[PDB]
Structure 1
Amino acid sequence: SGFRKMAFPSGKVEGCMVQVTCGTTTLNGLWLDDVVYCPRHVICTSEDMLNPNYEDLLIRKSNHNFLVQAGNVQLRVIGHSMQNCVLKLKVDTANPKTPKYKFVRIQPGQTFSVLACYNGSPSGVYQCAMRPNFTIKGSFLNGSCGSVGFNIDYDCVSFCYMHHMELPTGVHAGTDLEGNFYGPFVDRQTAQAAGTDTTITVNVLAWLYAAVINGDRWFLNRFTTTLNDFNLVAMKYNYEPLTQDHVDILGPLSAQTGIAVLDMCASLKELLQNGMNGRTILGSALLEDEFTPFDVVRQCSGVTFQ
């Protein structure tokens, strides 16, 4: 029993974190085999924020202008290249702690664990979601750039995020591990801001299923809804449209609980229209949207990782 915002065990990622310095600028890098991946703005100074020409800044650098430190060991850089908004630094030593890994680009609504790091050293781990507006509500300070987000499947670390920017509302923007930003964001100091965000409907439904699995039914009702009528209500409350693909993805949770997906949609419709009336669900007074259907199955079934 119980239901927590649970992150993946972080050890496999901790063994990959290093510190990268170019001049007076320092941030984190990810060391896999003989390559260190880091944000390309490591080559910027405070004077290179408004419109850096990264190609022109980088051509002026040599391999020896990059210092990479793994724990208390210096790794010599023997090559470098820029890919989108990341820099790949070839080093003289393959990381002996490299896990089985992949790079993946996630869709909005998917969750991942963040290992927040400073100066190449891990500080903490937490779970979060790619918002529909392609920001993440992270917890990051100066020097966290290059911290990564990931999921683990069996024994394989799937890296999905590398941290770059904080936006004016205090939320965060970053890239996949190939250096492509999520959303419209750029690595320059422009007036860019988070767009309007929405609530991740399929995830709210997954979490209502979690609540039923854990023994709570107070919020259910005797009604059903059509998918189209539900989405008319969802739109009014700034919820993402629920697609037939989402309904299919909720199939396993529906089967385990005996509550049809559209019946759970009718429960959610009533919670949106009426509120919770002083009650809580899984310890929250708000409808939680940072658990995916897979996250619920994983945590209610005790899945482990090799």
Structure 2
Amino acid sequence: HHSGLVKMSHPSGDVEACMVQVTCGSMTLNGLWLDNTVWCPRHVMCPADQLSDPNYDALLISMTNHSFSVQKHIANLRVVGHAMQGTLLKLTVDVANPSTPAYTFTTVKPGAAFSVLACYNGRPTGTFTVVMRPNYTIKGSFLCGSCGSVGYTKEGSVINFCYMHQMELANGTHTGSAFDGTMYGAFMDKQVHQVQLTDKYCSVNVVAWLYAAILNGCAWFVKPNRTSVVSFNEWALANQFTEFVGTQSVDMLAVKTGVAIEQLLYAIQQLYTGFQGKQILGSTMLEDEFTPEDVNMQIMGV
């Protein structure tokens, strides 16, 4: 019955030891301390009455190393260099973080999951996991003072930082930047109304979820009928679904269950029109917040 699926985050200890407070004048938020560098959102430079359409190039010129104050609560880190990369600041400090994990920087793609360490005044307060939506937002839980909170995946011992929180959109979702300084999607780090693209169902995640149902004995939606990937994807474009792109992790689920991807693509088409009062894994609507990897790890132990 119960699927054994939860929203699972990485353990956050490694990253907790990297979080700091960055203060610049009257703005304060979080930064990420790795080696001799502290990363943080650039709108920390901004006075709270210029946050809509600020000029960051001018703000940057007006700053010196002494404009920034960096404190660890969980020390005082003297800022000895400062630079801007896209929407992030890159502050150099005199002391290297002795608990710097092995890490990389990467970009996360729509439908992929990552873990977030929510932080306030440099103090980690919670952790959760999200999927990057097709419109390059996340359905997170961020309040005032959460900017600089980080998102990350993990491969073995290596932490892949992929997200630094910047803002909340009119519809309550959230977005931020990659550590190359680019905002995700077409968003800008300005407090003005911005067009929001439409979200979509992440087809590959829905397929993963239907497989999870099969692994827990729920398979009434499976028929011999099949829909080609190419045919589904044409359908997808007209129905607010991402185009499907199989992966080795989805293939493993097809092998373990003996149900072919194309049978579940047909199933999605029929379910999108209605569940007819039936339920799948307790839900009466499609679920796209679990990835094929989540299903492989949590249900199959792979």
TM-score by length of 1: 0.93
Q: Which residue of 1 aligns with 2:144?
A: 142
Letter in 2 for 1:266: Y
Q: Deviations over 1:159-196 (max 9, x none)?
A: 11111011111111211012111111111123203111
Asked if the contact 2:137–2:173 (Cα under 8 Å) also holds between the matched residues in 1, the reply is yes
CA RMSD, Structure 1 to Structure 2 (Å): 1.7
- Taking the TM superposition and a 5 Å limit, the aligned residue runs for 1:256-267 are 256-267=256-267
Higher mean C-alpha deviation, range 283-292 or range 255-264: 283-292
Q: 2:221 and 2:110 mapped to 1: Cα distance?
A: 27
Q: Secondary structure at the match of 2:100?
A: coil
1:195 to 184, 194, 197: 197
Asked if the contact 2:40–2:89 (Cα under 8 Å) also holds between the matched residues in 1, the reply is yes
Whether 1:216 and 2:212 are equivalent positions in the alignment is no
Q: 1:107 and 1:99 mapped to 2: Cα distance?
A: 23
TM-score by length of 2: 0.94
**1:126, CA displacement in angstroms?**
1.0
Letter in 2 for 1:197: D
Cα separation, partners in 2 of 1:298 and 1:72, compared to 1, 3 Å: closer
Q: 2:119 and 2:214 mapped to 1: Cα distance?
A: 36
Q: Which residue of 2 aligns with 1:158?
A: 160
Higher mean C-alpha deviation, range 229-238 or range 55-64: 229-238
Cα separation, partners in 2 of 1:85 and 1:129, compared to 1, 3 Å: same
Q: Secondary structure at the match of 2:171?
A: coil
Q: Secondary structure at the match of 1:20?
A: strand
Q: 2:179 and 2:200 mapped to 1: Cα distance?
A: 25
- Taking the TM superposition and a 5 Å limit, the aligned residue runs for 1:43-192 are 43-71=45-73, 73-192=75-194
Letter in 2 for 1:138: G
Higher mean C-alpha deviation, range 288-297 or range 12-21: 288-297
Higher mean C-alpha deviation, range 199-208 or range 278-287: 278-287
Letter in 1 for 2:24: C
Q: Which residue of 2 aligns with 1:272?
A: 272
Unaligned runs of 5+ in 1: none
- Number of residue pairs aligned between Structure 1 and Structure 2: 300
**1:223, CA displacement in angstroms?**
1.6
Q: 2:4 and 2:128 mapped to 1: Cα distance?
A: 18
**1:247, CA displacement in angstroms?**
6.0
**1:293, CA displacement in angstroms?**
1.5
Unaligned runs of 5+ in 2: none
**1:218, CA displacement in angstroms?**
2.5
**1:72, CA displacement in angstroms?**
6.4
Q: Deviations over 1:249-282 (max 9, x none)?
A: 5211111111111011122222122x22333323
- Taking the TM superposition and a 5 Å limit, the aligned residue runs for 1:226-237 are 226-237=228-239
Letter in 1 for 2:189: D
Letter in 1 for 2:292: P
What fraction of aligned residue pairs are identical, expressed as a percent? 51
Q: Deviations over 1:55-109 (max 9, x none)?
A: 2111111211111111161111111111111001111211111111110012212
Q: Which residue of 2 aligns with 1:294?
A: 293
Letter in 1 for 2:154: I
